[PDB]
Amino acid sequence: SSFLHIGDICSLYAEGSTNGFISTLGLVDDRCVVQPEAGDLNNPPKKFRDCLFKLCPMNRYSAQKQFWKASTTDAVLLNKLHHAADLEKKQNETENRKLLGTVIQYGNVIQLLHLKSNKYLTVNKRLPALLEKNAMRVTLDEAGNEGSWFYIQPFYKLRSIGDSVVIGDKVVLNPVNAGQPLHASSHQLVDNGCNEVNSVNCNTSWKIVLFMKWSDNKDDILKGGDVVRLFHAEQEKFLTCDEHRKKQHVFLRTTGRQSATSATSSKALWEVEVVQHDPCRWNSLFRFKHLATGHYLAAEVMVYSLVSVPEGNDISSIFELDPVPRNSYVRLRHLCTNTWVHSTNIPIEEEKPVMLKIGTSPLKEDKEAFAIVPVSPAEVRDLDFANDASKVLGSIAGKLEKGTITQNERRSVTKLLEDLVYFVTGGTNSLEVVFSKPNRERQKLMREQNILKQIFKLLQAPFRHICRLCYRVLRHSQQDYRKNQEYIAKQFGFMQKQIGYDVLAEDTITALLHNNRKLLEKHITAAEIDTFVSLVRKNREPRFLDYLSDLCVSMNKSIPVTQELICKAVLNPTNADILIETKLVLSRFEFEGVSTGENALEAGEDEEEVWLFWRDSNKEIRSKSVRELAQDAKEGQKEDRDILSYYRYQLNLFARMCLDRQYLAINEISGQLDVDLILRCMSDENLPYDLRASFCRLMLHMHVDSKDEIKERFAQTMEFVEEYLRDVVCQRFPFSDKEKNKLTFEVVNLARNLIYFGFYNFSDLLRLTKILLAILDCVHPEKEDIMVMDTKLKIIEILQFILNVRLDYRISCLLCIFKREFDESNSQSSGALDFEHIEEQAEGIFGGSEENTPLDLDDHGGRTFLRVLLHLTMHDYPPLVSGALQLLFRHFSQRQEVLQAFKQVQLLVTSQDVDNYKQIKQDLDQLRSIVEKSELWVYVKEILIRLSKLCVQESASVRKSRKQQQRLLRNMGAHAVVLELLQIPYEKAEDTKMQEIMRLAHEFLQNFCAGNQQNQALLHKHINLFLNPGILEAVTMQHIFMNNFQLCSEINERVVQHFVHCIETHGRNVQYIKFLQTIVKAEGKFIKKCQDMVMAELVNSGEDVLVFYNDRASFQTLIQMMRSERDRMDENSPLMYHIHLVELLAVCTEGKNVYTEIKCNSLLPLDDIVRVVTHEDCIPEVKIAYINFLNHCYVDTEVEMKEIYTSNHMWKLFENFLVDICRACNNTSDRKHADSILEKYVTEIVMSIVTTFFSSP
Ligand SMILES: O=P(O)(O)O[C@@H]1[C@H](O)[C@H](O)[C@@H](OP(=O)(O)O)[C@H](OP(=O)(O)O)[C@H]1O
């Protein structure tokens, strides 16, 4: 008849005194029960996916059971016992696939495996059970042990061991050694009508009810119960179910990612109900149970439309497929109705929604094609092992808001809020952790499955394992996850009281502090002078107060900050003593050196605490260099010191330079300096990884060959460094290298910059180099990538002093050494008064030392030195020009005082553009903040007129400065954000700005329509410009029409035609007949210039991507209607600026008849031009005699054309034997001396013109 097999999926139905279908209580609770009333044979359980199992051969638990004795100090013996538990664990997978399908046979030793929870049924021999007192504890263990082997055997003696098992047979399962047979209890659990199954010799009879037979070739085939998402072929959109307006709606969901297929949520997942007849396992129909709610899908009231139905029974919840295979791309058909599905664009209150309704149509299409994207089974068990969590905190957060919870529930919830930690980090944290790194897909599975929501509706009403243990879960799921962080605001202020009962809420606000930088710092504020004083007066160890200290990041933190320091001098009530002033401290040290406990222990705390925050002082040095008195560092330790001298140094000497030099020399060198400069540039610049820099490290170890007070610490250094060279003679950077290579670390780099701030141009700084050579040479997988982040930085401090020296300090003398003669008498080396401008420019560095509190020396003395700059702006670029930029950098803080500009204004006085603006993009991300703040207030004035000047500068330069804008970081953000504020504002003539800082960026090699390929995407997303009745603000029009030209004006795609046609389209021309003289006259006293620029804007449509403008059939869709309308604008005068609208309309007028061949059917356009070119006054023809001679040759080539365009063009043959005969210009201007090339290119352009005419039309 019909047999059971290894592979079949069935159900087992208990037939003793309590009946049922076994089932779990979720992926949280590892128990097993019989829901007697949850279903019967005749009426199957409604969740008959959690009462399903797979029949497994016998598994191997000896080397894995050996591996569950982690009785060993040894580490090589542990990695051994594992490689045997994992080889075993894969020998199981191997052997289990061959045996796939066998007639099982009675008295085989099978185990049983849960599909939905993917854990093995297992008898825990050495336990009692929970609801029953004798029976062993039957649990669901994920990987199994010997306690999951089950002897299957026939209950009745109808069949008997040694025949092959039939389907249905009642059987008893009997573990191989764990003792007694499985048995469905009589004992309702506590919480749930759920009888707890356990092991105890009993007369229960297990029927075996098949579900799928062992033919489900997957993920190979779509068979009933596979979880899939349903992607859209045309629309490129997944199929989802949610609620809008408190109503369940299905829809297609829109994504803003830049990779459609990277939009995965746990709500587009649909269970497949391969409809059968009884509840079991491409020509038959299908139903989609929405994988999240439990509501199927069904199309009800395009004749019909899709929405969720609570029960998937109604014939409506049945469909039919059209091209089975896993990952098929199908078209589907709603059965009851006979219609084929279709996606609209009317959505369901929001501003810019996302939910696009989906409906049906009796018309079968070809593009509405969906993709049966199969879901990974783990992800399905992820959504599983979270929903549980949502409903666990749904009982417990419900039972503790209105009253009390037992001692069994605390133990299981606390447990829960440890497991989730064990989830969200992709199995890394938990306890005594080593690492703690997040896993993204789970975090999204929390805000979307209201784990988070549950959490905040739990805290709100001992707790020592509830809060802030939640609050560390919250510290894991918002990690580097913006969208989930835009939630802790109202929550952030639990961190306070949750910071009490435990400093765990501390963890969060610093996970805050850093990223939530800038904007975290404004809400604490003086709050802090009451949460360290508190955190000091309650957190006796004061952890809170400390990692607070460790949280300070960004210049703007120093303020509010320094305030608490003062509380500290009123708060030094630590009830202990420290003094000597060299002895009893020192003695202190000989004593905590003792690794003894309690006392010695303590020292670590105030030691770190001093190092970090006391050095904390960076360039607030003054506050730092005033708070850090006596300079001591004999015993230096962990880097504390290196930091402190930073604190003091800032007070003294912002070092700067300029780059040593300039001119052709630096080259002759570097070239002389050959690759070298390159080999090391890659390793540090790149080779963040060890290996790559390692190679340039071989390329090294072959080679072959008045400071006074700032000095008196420097020497103790060089000795110590040699030390690093004497410890260096010691290869091992083992344990030592934690201490040494930290203290070091804090040394290595701060020394890079200490040689860039304290060398000397005599044989000393260098000869010290010499000794450093022998220093730097004295020093040259596994847990060493967590350590090798730190190694990576060390090699930076290395190659860092190394390059600040070796690159830019290095080689400075051989230079001035080589002075001799060259031609003019032996002259060996042993802009006018360059001095005066470099000692007003030193009046400058002294400028660079001063500050705003200095009201006396602030305004009166310095003044606008800018005049010197403005006056020497024409003269050649000094070398201490990067030392100029010294001054520049400082003003990046702020500018309220009107004063800035006049001084700031000297800088504008510049005449070595290219080279600088290379150094000026230094601020590109800041100065992008200068256009985004300068832009939220423009369209104190020095930051928008200065971020614009900076812009026309990185705008009137190289084609490479153009590509360098490289403004994915951030164009689309300076056009979308400068617009955003800057569209709705527009400034009237004459002073008005939106047009020069969005009009010096698109200087695309000073015409024509090219190299602006970036201008289809940033011009892609934007808000448009006004239209129809009314009017708007002036200038930023003139600006706009032009600006559009250069964004969608490139010549290369077919867009450009629909682009200078999408929007204004043909329709624009109409409104350009009358009324913009009116918006320019309400626009500004000079009405007719914003109008006349409105006229170079409407006449230049042919000029930019004309060629392209035509693109596809652009001269066929407005043929006829633009030429006649043009006669409507055929007359004008007094046009110097509008005659740049008559050379931007003689370029505009040149782009009417350069491309046509069977489209022209109008008359008379030819006399009118001739008339307009004769009616001229003002400027020497030569530009209107190369635009009208340029007209006279572009006309004179055609020939038989015009000979259809009008009756004759005979006034046009005298007129080009004039704009071409001319005079010395036309009388006596005599301004051109490349005549022979004039007459030449004009007589090989009169020879190219001669070849043409023969082919006229
Ligand atoms: O840019 P960020 O800061 O990474 O933030 C993502 C961005 O807003 C995506 O557009 C969004 O996808 P949708 O547009 O499809 O929502 C995604 O949501 P998700 O994390 O929920 O996928 C966000 O995390």
Distance 443 CA to ligand 1 centre (A): 13
Q: Cα(1106)–Cα(1051) distance, rounded to whole angstroms?
A: 8
Q: Under DSSP, is residue 1142 helix (H, G, I), strand (E, B) or coil?
A: coil
- Write 687-695 long-range contacts (CB < 8 A, 24+): 688/792, 689/792, 690/788, 690/791, 690/792, 690/795, 693/795, 693/799
Side chain identity at residue 858, one-letter code: D
Beta bridge mates, 229 = 373
Residue whose C-alpha is closest to residue 661's, from 811, 803, 560, 545: 811
| Helix orientation angle between 708-726 and 763-778, rounded to the nearest 10 degrees | 30
Ligand 1 atom closest to Cα of residue 254: 15
The C-alpha atoms of residue 856 and residue 440 are separated, in whole angstroms, by 56
Whole-angstrom CA distances from 1104 to 771, 885, 1100 are 64, 39, 8
Distance CA(508)–CA(494), nearest Å, equals: 10
Residues 890, 668: contact at Cβ < 8 Å? no
> DSSP letter string over 577-622?
----SSHHHHHHHHHHTS--STHHHHHHHHHHHHHHHHH--SS-TT
Task: Report the first-to-last Cα separation within the chain, whole angstroms.
Answer: 91
Residue 253 among known ligand-binding residues: yes
Cis, peptide link before residue 970, omega less than 30° from 0: yes
- How far is CA 1220 from its chain centroid? 61
The one-character DSSP state at 413 is H
DSSP secondary structure string, 249-318?
Answer: EEEEE---SS-GGG---SSS-EEEEE--SSS----S-EEEEETTTS-EEEE-----BEEEESSS-SGGG-
Question: Contact 100/214 with Cβ under 8 angstroms?
Answer: yes
Residues in the chain: 1257
**932 is known to lie in a ligand binding site:** yes
Q: Which of 258, 477, 483, 484 best tests ligand 1's pocket when mutated (most atoms within 8 Å of CB)?
A: 483
Q: Report how far residue 52's alpha carbon sits from residue 42's, in angstroms, rounded to the nearest whole number.
A: 16
Please tell me what resolution, in angstroms, this structure has. 6.2
- Within 13 A of 554's CA, how many CA atoms are on the CB side? 14
Task: State the angle between helix axes of 690-700 and 677-685 in degrees (0 to 180), rounded to the nearest 10.
Answer: 160
* 999 carries a ligand binding annotation: no
Instruction: Select from 1175, 1162, 1088, 1155 the least CA-distant residue to 1125.
Output: 1162
Q: For residue 876, what is the DSSP state? A: P
Distance separating alpha carbons of residues 662 and 901, to the nearest angstrom: 29
Is 547 annotated as a binding-site member? no
Q: For 47, list phi and psi in degrees, rounded to 5.
A: -95, 45
When computed from its CA atoms, the radius of gyration of the chain, rounded to whole angstroms, is: 41
Task: Collect contacts of 400-407 with beta carbons under 8 A, ≥24 apart.
Answer: 400/458, 400/461, 401/457, 401/458, 401/460, 401/461
Ligand 1 neighbourhood includes 259 CB (under 6 angstroms)? no
The single-letter DSSP state of residue 1237 is: H
Residue 751 backbone dihedrals phi, psi, to 5 degrees: -80, -45
Residues 6+ apart with CB under 8 A from 824: none
- Is position 935 annotated in a ligand binding site? yes
637 sits in the region (left: phi over 0; alpha: psi -120 to 50; else beta) called: left
**Other CB atoms closer than 10 Å to residue 554's CB: what's the count?**
12
Tokens of 864: 């606008």
Structure tokens at 71: 């009785």
Residue 263 Cα: closest atom of ligand 1: 15
Report the alpha-carbon angle 766-772-777, nearest 5: 140
Nearest to 880 by CA among 851, 840, 828, 927: 840
Which residue has 């052997």 as its token pair?
95
The Cα 495–Cα 500 span in angstroms is 8
If you take atom 13 of ligand 1, which residue's CA is the nearest one? 255
Give the sign of the dihedral formed by CA 418, CA 422, CA 424, CA 429. Answer: positive
Ligand 1 centre from 256 Cα, in Å? 7
Contact 20, 34 (CB under 8 A): yes
Q: Can you read off the two tokens belonging to residue 323? A: 């091209």
* Distance, CA of 413 to chain centre: 35
Measured distance CA(1183)–CA(1181) in Å, rounded: 5
Q: What is the 3-state secondary structure (H, E, C) of 864-885?
A: CCHHHHHHHCCCCCCCCHHHHH
Experimental technique of record: X-ray
Whose tokens are 């006396």? That residue is 856
Q: Is the CB of 263 under 6 A from ligand 1?
A: yes
Label each residue of 920-961 as H, E or C. HHHHCCHHHHHHHHHHHCCCCCHHHHHHHHHHHHCCCCCHHH
425 vs 940: CA distance, rounded Å = 48
Does ligand 1 lie within 6 Å of residue 257's CB atom?
A: yes
Cis bond upstream, residue 581 (ω within 30): yes
> From CA 1040, how far away is CA 1098, in angstroms rounded?
11
Q: Which residues have C-beta within 8 Å of that of residue 1142, sequence separation ≥ 6?
A: 1132, 1135, 1149, 1172, 1184, 1187
For the chain, helix, strand, coil in percent to 5 are 45, 10, 45
**Any atom of ligand 1 within 6 Å of the Cβ of 255:** yes
Please tell me the distance between residue 689's alpha carbon and the centre of ligand 1 in angstroms. Answer: 30
What number does the ligand 1 atom closest to the CA of 354 have?
Answer: 14
Cα–Cα distance for residue pair 304/339, rounded to 1 Å: 8
CB of 40 closer than 8 Å to CB of 19: yes
In order, the DSSP letters of 303-365 are: --BEEEESSS-SGGG-EEEE---TT-EEEEEETTTTEEEEEEEEE---SS--EEEEEEESS--
Complete domains list, the chain, with CATH:
9-57+99-212 (2.80.10.50), 227-375 (2.80.10.50), 663-817 (no CATH), 834-982 (no CATH), 1154-1257 (no CATH)
The two tokens of residue 412 are 């299981």
CA distances (Å), 654 to each of 106, 757, 851, 887, 928, in order? 87, 8, 13, 11, 25
From 1135, 1170, 1178, select the one nearest 1149 (Cα to Cα). 1170
∠ CA 1090-1092-1096, nearest 5°, is 110
User: Are 211 and 237 a contacting pair, CB within 8 Å?
Assistant: no
How many whole angstroms separate alpha carbon 285 and alpha carbon 308? 18
Q: Is 426 left (phi over 0), alpha (psi -120 to 50) or beta?
A: left
Q: CB of 310 within 8 A of CB of 291?
A: no
The answer to whether 1104 and 1041 are in contact (CB under 8 A) is no
Q: Are 1119 and 1158 in contact (CB under 8 A)?
A: no
**Is 444 labelled as part of a ligand binding site?**
yes
- The H or E element spanning position 170 is strand 168-175
